[PDB]
Amino acid sequence: RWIARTFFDAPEKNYERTMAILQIESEKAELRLKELEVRRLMRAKGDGPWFQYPTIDKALIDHSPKATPDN
């Protein structure tokens, strides 16, 4: 009884530690699988803000009266 009193831990302490720790890592695993599914559909269709390789910037396209009428 003295050994359990001065050194060891209650099963309540360890049990709730296990339960909280499973909650944490279940969040981690669900976010990881959701991450890779979001990544594969976002590479497939391209609608998302990740895989957008830079196209032409149209600010340099400056329409104006040219020399030749038929451009």
Binding site: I24, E27, K28, L31, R32, P49, Q52
Partner: protein, 57 residues
């Protein structure tokens, strides 16, 4: 009559009134396909740090 135009008075960009209307889309092209949904708003600290193999927070 017919006064000769001074150098360089065949210049000097000119107004004129018309009768036909000014046109929309003179480049006979389609409409613009899609805008990109803009990501805005504030950002929270990340969910459990890295979510790599380990190195949690």
């Amino acid at each position: 009559g017919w006064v000769r135009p001074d150098l360089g008075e065949l210049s000097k960009v000119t107004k004129v009134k018309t009768d036909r209307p000014l046109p929309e889309n003179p480049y006979h092209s389609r409409a613009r396909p899609e805008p990109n949904p803009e990501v805005e708003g504030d950002l929270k600290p990340a969910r459990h740090g890295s979510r790599l193999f380990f190195w949690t927070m």
